[PDB]
Amino acid sequence: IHRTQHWFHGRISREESHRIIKQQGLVDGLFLLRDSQSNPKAFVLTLCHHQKIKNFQILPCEDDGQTFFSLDDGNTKFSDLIQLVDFYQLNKGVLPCKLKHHCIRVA
Template sequence: MWCEGEKLRFSNLESVRSRVAMDFTGSVGRIVDDPKEAKAIAVAEGYSWKRRWRPTMRTPSNLAHVNGIESGVHITQPWFHSGMTRDQATALVNKHGTVDGVFVVRDSRSNPGCFVLTYKCGSKVLHAQINPIMDPVREAHVFSLDSGVTKFYDLLQLVEFYQLNAGCLPTRLTHYVVQSTSPIKVPNSVTTPAMAAGSY
């Protein structure tokens, strides 16, 4: 078992290690090691974001709406389970979750327009709410697990990030569960010891 001091020290180390520069311009995200390249990507990404997300009088159809999201890249992903209840997600992850990081993403029943990441950590099934929020700097809707500290264009980008980084979660996402099948291993993933998380 971990004592409180060790948990805090490990948590601080994990937070530092989890914050890496990422390049999502290709078909798969990659970690950027060179600080100059990271800065160049950040600058280019900032300009690109501003061009793509110019506010208009009408809301683009692909943005998150508070009342719900009718479509998006996430609906084609094997880890997304539309219409699944909290109890169904808990049972599915419990059944297939033999290691930390087994997960599914589902619609939130209690907060329409939001999503929930259901995942296994330390023999517990945890639920983390994914909120669509307005980014005041970009004047666009983005997704976040941590009240806007880390923001993503879509759920696919969010899931890819947390497969590589624990971030605000107590473990990295390592495997996803497809309905009626076994968990699928996510390449290049590492799990970390469990810590507490909220439930949604």
């Protein structure tokens, strides 16, 4: 589970995640994943690029009993958040840039 993943920050707010990204340098490709505050089964990719912070909702869908996740309306689907991060570290897709450095969790 992504709960052991260093890029996963769990239940922090939008505001908190922006504060974290800024404090750790506002560098291109700096990112973190967290829980969505608007959907208990969704997550959010928070990503910095050109000194701007974007939030991408990662929505679940069920295909034949198994949950898949997507931030681009099903064009690109993943069995879990680990696959999602591995993919966007290697491909830009709809993102402004590839995922590069994760933010370190803050107490």
